[PDB]
From TrEMBL, chain B:
<feature type="region of interest" description="Disordered">
    <location>
        <begin position="1"/>
        <end position="37"/>
    </location>
</feature>
<keyword id="KW-0687">Ribonucleoprotein</keyword>
<dbReference type="GO" id="GO:0006412">
    <property type="term" value="P:translation"/>
</dbReference>
<dbReference type="InterPro" id="IPR011332">
    <property type="entry name" value="Ribosomal_zn-bd"/>
</dbReference>
<dbReference type="GO" id="GO:0003735">
    <property type="term" value="F:structural constituent of ribosome"/>
</dbReference>
<protein>
    <recommendedName>
        <fullName>Large ribosomal subunit protein bL32</fullName>
    </recommendedName>
</protein>
<dbReference type="GO" id="GO:0015934">
    <property type="term" value="C:large ribosomal subunit"/>
</dbReference>
<keyword id="KW-0689">Ribosomal protein</keyword>
<dbReference type="Pfam" id="PF01783">
    <property type="entry name" value="Ribosomal_L32p"/>
</dbReference>
<dbReference type="InterPro" id="IPR002677">
    <property type="entry name" value="Ribosomal_bL32"/>
</dbReference>
<dbReference type="InterPro" id="IPR044957">
    <property type="entry name" value="Ribosomal_bL32_bact"/>
</dbReference>
<comment type="similarity">
    <text>Belongs to the bacterial ribosomal protein bL32 family.</text>
</comment>
Amino acid sequence: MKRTFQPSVLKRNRSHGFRARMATKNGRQVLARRRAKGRARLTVSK
Amino acid sequence: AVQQNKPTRSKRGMRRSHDALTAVTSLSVDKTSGEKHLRHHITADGYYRGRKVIAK
Amino acid sequence: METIAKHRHARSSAQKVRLVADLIRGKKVSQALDILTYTNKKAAVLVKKVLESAIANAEHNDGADIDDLKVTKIFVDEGPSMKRIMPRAKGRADRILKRTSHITVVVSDR
RNA sequence: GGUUAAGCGACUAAGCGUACACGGUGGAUGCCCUGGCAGUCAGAGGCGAUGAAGGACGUGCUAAUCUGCGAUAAGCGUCGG
RNA sequence: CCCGGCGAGGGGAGUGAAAAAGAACCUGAAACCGUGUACGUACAAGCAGUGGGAGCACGCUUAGGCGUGUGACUGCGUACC
RNA sequence: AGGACCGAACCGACUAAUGUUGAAAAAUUAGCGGAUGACUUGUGGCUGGGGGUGAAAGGCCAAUCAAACCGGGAGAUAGCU
RNA sequence: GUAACGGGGCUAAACCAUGCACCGAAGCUGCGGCAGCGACGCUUAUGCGUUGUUGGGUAGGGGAGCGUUCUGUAAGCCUGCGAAGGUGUGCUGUGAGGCAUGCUGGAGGUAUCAGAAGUGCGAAUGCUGACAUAAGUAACGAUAAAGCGGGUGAAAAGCCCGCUCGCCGGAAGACCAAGGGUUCCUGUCCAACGUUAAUCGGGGCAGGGUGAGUCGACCCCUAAGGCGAGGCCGAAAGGCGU
RNA sequence: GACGACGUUGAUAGGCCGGGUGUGUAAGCGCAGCGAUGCGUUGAGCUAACCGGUACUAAUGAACCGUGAGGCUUAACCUU
């Protein structure tokens, strides 16, 4: 059966990447929360 | 389909009262090599009833 | 004199090994080896190596004779179990217990 | 003493139970603190285009990770201790 | 040094106050699983105990007819929240 | 010529059996329907929650839909267990 | 399934009447003991001489206590001539409990009188961890199929070589994208991983391996669409767009 | 599991010999025919579990378990 996760690096970065998060007020707040929490990986970039 | 109460150590051991093994009553001895083997079977060296059956 | 040998963390459940241990408890060493040699079970291979080790220890360390030895104490204790995951149907997960055993053999010349 | 008969009758444990002894499994308990919690008295209350916060990759006699550092790369100069 | 597959894992030797502190490492409880000893158990029916109680075993005992364990048989008795 | 005909690929899912702690959180086997079209398919893009989309079933919107998910108000309230 | 005396059995061991005996309860009495409330001797800084009486108990009210951790008393006392903790024994109190001591253990413990509480668990389809049960039971994942010889090895149905057999063959063959990211090759190892064994492996360890002017990407050009200098709009955020 | 038969002083199983049953005239060769085929050798060849026989093969000598005269009392008998 076809499942939900059909990977694509392009769509992954364009939807959840660093530059996508850094392009909106609410996206920049996502990074601020993950920095304050201490996340080692902020985004799905690499 | 499934139990209503947990069986005991006792009933577990009773069921296993017939699970014991049986040791070979005795091993046979060859005429020539004097080796010890199962009855009606050949020896490790290859003898059987003192006739030097297959050895290779 | 009394001598001991052990095989700890053996890959087999105590229940399976105890079937073999009950065959040689109280038997002469010469008779026990012949029983394990012609016992078609894996636990027999393990127990035999332990018995062979105890015999060697008595000869080398205790300077005992082989023809006078005798299996006087033998028991199998439960060892640590290893936990594993078995995927079942409909996303359910079951736990496997890979059980181990502590085999102990004691020979003596009493 | 012997035969027959009648009557009575222990010693069996495949296994199980209780108790005790000796062990295994397991990691409670007690003891311990270079970790935390809550405060007091003092400080400092901002960093950043002289490129920040936070990161990537690198850097050793070094294969990895941590710490530190940045192609002058677990460090360079100078003034003192 | 020895058994073992130039293994795993053990037995000795040695270290140490201690190796039953040997790295699956202070102390090492309980459930749970075992070996050994004593007693009981294969014509007996049910919350499995309680009251009575023979016999066996063991320890006493200045025999003192006591203690411990087991519990044939027997009266009563349908868990807890 | 054809939202034409028979029929593989391809897209679908009418019947039955199996399976139902499955090989599989909807499949397998034997048959079945469409198969130049209102067809099918790859890549990328747009529509965001009282909103979307819907040849319309209250269907679908990441195994979740008569109002998604995450966090917060929040230890909502519970004359009930 | 006797099944309409509880049963056996009873012609009284049934029914009526009379009477004398006996059994029969945690009721009553006797013996010993504890406690509560009362009156009494103003007894006594109150315990009795005594004295009578009471003492089943849910919701619930009242009263009195045990023990746990911490503070003071305590730079005191106990303790390597062995603390806490753990495990047994014996004694003791109405109870929660307490004292002593053997073994284990190997360094802390703490009287008394006061003080403060994360102060006592069998239950909440309670929370976490550990271990049982069913049970050595079901199952070992397409019914395409295996057999033998030799080799290696501690050990070979499963590895290597070889001769046969069988299966796919618009694939179960071959080359790629997407995606994964060293799984590739060689050597070595078999604890764990492999639903069995394993000398084998997409497993462990180590080393080696990816060579482009022409393939592809980057690059030039744009589609849907996105961002968007100024600009228009909008409480702010921000929206649309040249 | 059990039950039954046999284990060399032996037909227990297999094989082998013979037979039967079933199928229905093998292969090879030859003859006729251009050939497909047909005819003859030939009711041929093959033939499982069946029947009657046969030690060719395997069922080994041993070893193991199990004992050593079987309680007390009483009565009647030996010794009506």
